[PDB]
Structures are given as structure tokens and as C-alpha cells.
Design a binder for this molecule. Structure first.
Ligand code: PVY
Ligand code: CL
Length: 292
């Protein structure tokens, strides 16, 4: 499994800030837009892109506050990410896209697609944001720790002051051990404790047991859109999962129109880090089939 990130940095000014993005592959045709989540960056896609890039343009931004993108003194609410991602997509002139999305990047991508349904030609997704109706549907092993994260004093202490989302949660979201290079590359954006705001606001945004009500609503709205859309869909899932347990993956593979579902083997949240070969191969192949 490659630890390298052999992509030249590109930057675009967005709302007066700058965002970093990978942009590889051919200049024409429909681009594939890869959206990471918490607490990753475009780095999470490094072993998936090289399988897609021979045939398609691959664009992988770092969310505002993350990666190599700028770090303005925001609250990094989901609304903030929405604003910056809408503006990134316009600043690059993108017209139609294929979306490849994960964790909070999935809330972004689905919320975009709902609002711009004529510009979305396919969606591949994995470990994605859906409403978690009660805390019982959060996995038991991570339950206590996510509940602590969703406080101000204790959660900030953990995420911001002790860097637990990077040091603890991130390796607990991958079945294989991450290597020290890997860990250092995920550490890099968050060396300064003050830059850890998004790492804490994210889990506080998770739509769990009805809260926060605004996020619950928005997520329900794009899940309804999704259930009704004929757009081609590709769902990766793993066992036991985190956000998407196998039973849920099986239900969505039948409930969503035009949905192909692919089991990656063992997986928790960062499926890309457990089976990037399968994921990149199956995306490249599926992309071919969107023309058939
Ligand atoms: C969009 C959703 C994203 C989900 C992201 C990944 O998924 C969630 C899986 O949740 C795990 C939640 N639990 C913890 O973060 C946690 C609990 C207990 C302990 C612990 O060590 O007591 C840690 C922990 C570590 C666990 C594993 C680990 N590995 C596999 C190398 C390393 C750990 O290191 C630390 C370090 C600290 N510090 C104070 C620095 C604290 C806890 C751990 C995590
Ligand atoms: Cl999160």
C-alpha cells in the first residue's frame, strides 16, 4: 500500500481564501471529483486516483481548514464547508461531474447533487453520512468516545488539546495498521492545536439521535433525493463498517435505483486504506460502464 502522494499541488482562490487540490488525468471528458472527510485530506485518495487517472480527469480538493488548504478562523460548520465547496466547483468551471465521496465529503457531494441534479452523471460513495436514528445504531466500540466528543469541555479537550481524533480515532477507523509515514502525513495539517477546529466541529455535526436538527433535516433531504434519482450509483462497504454496517449496505443496494454495491472485505471507516486496489479498480471499471 503506497504511502507517497506523487501529485503536484494546485491552488485556487475561493471566497478570498485558497484551497489546495490534485488535478490529474486527461483535460477533457467528465471529471471525477473526489471528496474526503474527517480527519483526512486528499491524501486518503492517493492509491485510488492512479487507477482512474488513465481514463478520467481526477480532481481531489482539500476541504477548507484541512490538508493544504487555508485555515481561516471559522467555526467549520457543515454550512461553511458547503459554501467553500460550491465555490471551489464554480471556480474550476466544472459543468458535469462524477462524484467519489466519503464520510463528510459524502454529505457535501449528496447535498450538491440534490441542488444540481442535471450536473451529476454518477456517484460512487462509501462510509457515508446518513441519519443515525439513535445512539444504539452507532457502533458500540466507538460509542462512548463519540458521545464525549459531542461535548464542549471534554470533547475539545480530547480533539483540540490532545489531538485524539488524529492519534486515536483515525487509526481506529482502519483495520490494518497505518505506518508512521502515513500517520505523519495525516498529522501534518494539524501540528498547530488551533488548526484543529474542524476535527471537533465535524463530529458535533453528525446527525445522531435527532441532533443537530438542521443537519438531520438536510441529510434526510438528500437521502430522499437519492432514493428518487435514476443517477448511476456505486456503493462500497466493509465489515463491520462504522457509519454504514453491512445490513444497511444491503438495504441501500436494493432501495436506491441503479445501484451497484461492492463488498471490500474487512473495513471500518477509511475503506480506502484497507482495500484501495479494489476500490480504484471497481471505480475505473464502473466509469467505463456509464457509457454503455
Ligand atoms: C465521519 C465519521 C468518521 C469516523 C472516523 C473513524 O471512526 C470512528 C472509529 O472510532 C474510535 C473512537 N475511539 C477512540 O478514538 C479511542 C478510544 C480509546 C483509545 C485508547 O487508546 O484508549 C484510543 C486511542 C488509540 C486507539 C487505537 C490506536 N491505534 C489503533 C494505533 C491508537 C490510539 O492512540 C490514542 C492516543 C491518545 N492520546 C491521548 C494521544 C488517546 C487515545 C488513543 C482511541
Ligand atoms: Cl466526524
Amino acid at each position: 500500500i503506497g504511502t507517497g502522494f506523487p501529485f503536484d499541488p494546485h491552488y485556487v482562490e475561493v471566497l478570498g481564501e485558497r484551497m489546495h487540490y490534485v488535478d490529474v488525468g486527461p483535460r477533457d471528458g467528465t471529471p471525477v471529483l473526489f471528496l474526503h472527510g474527517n480527519p483526512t485530506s486528499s491524501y486518503v485518495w492517493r492509491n485510488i486516483i492512479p487507477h482512474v487517472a488513465p481514463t478520467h480527469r481526477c480532481i481531489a480538493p482539500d476541504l477548507i481548514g484541512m490538508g493544504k488548504s487555508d485555515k481561516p478562523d471559522l467555526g467549520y460548520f457543515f454550512d461553511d464547508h458547503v459554501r467553500f465547496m460550491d465555490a471551489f466547483i464554480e471556480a474550476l468551471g466544472l459543468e458535469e461531474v462524477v462524484l467519489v465521496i466519503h464520510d463528510w465529503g459524502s454529505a457535501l457531494g449528496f447535498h450538491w447533487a440534490k441542488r444540481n441534479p442535471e450536473r451529476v452523471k454518477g456517484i460512487a460513495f462509501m462510509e457515508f453520512i446518513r441519519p443515525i436514528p439513535t445512539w444504539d445504531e452507532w457502533p458500540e466500540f466507538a460509542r462512548e468516545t463519540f458521545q464525549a466528543f459531542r461535548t464542549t469541555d471534554v470533547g475539545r479537550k480530547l480533539i483540540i488539546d490532545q489531538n485524539v481524533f488524529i492519534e486515536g480515532t483515525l487509526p481506529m477507523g482502519v483495520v490494518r495498521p497505518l505506518t508512521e509515514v502515513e500517520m505523519d502525513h495525516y498529522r501534518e495539517p494539524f501540528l498547530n492545536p488551533v488548526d484543529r477546529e474542524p476535527l471537533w466541529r465535524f463530529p458535533n455535526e453528525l446527525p445522531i439521535a435527532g441532533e443537530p436538527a438542521n443537519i438531520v433535516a438536510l441529510v434526510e433531504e438528500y437521502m430522499d433525493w437519492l432514493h428518487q434519482s435514476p443517477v448511476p450509483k456505486l456503493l462500497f462497504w466493509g465489515t463491520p463498517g462504522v457509519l454504514i454496517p453491512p445490513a444497511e449496505a444491503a438495504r441501500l443496494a436494493k432501495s436506491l435505483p441503479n445501484c451497484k454495491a461492492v463488498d471490500i472485505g474487512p473495513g471500518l471507516n477509511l475503506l480506502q486504506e484497507d482495500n484501495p486496489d479494489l476500490i480504484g479498480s471497481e471505480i475505473a471499471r464502473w466509469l467505463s460502464t456509464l457509457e454503455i
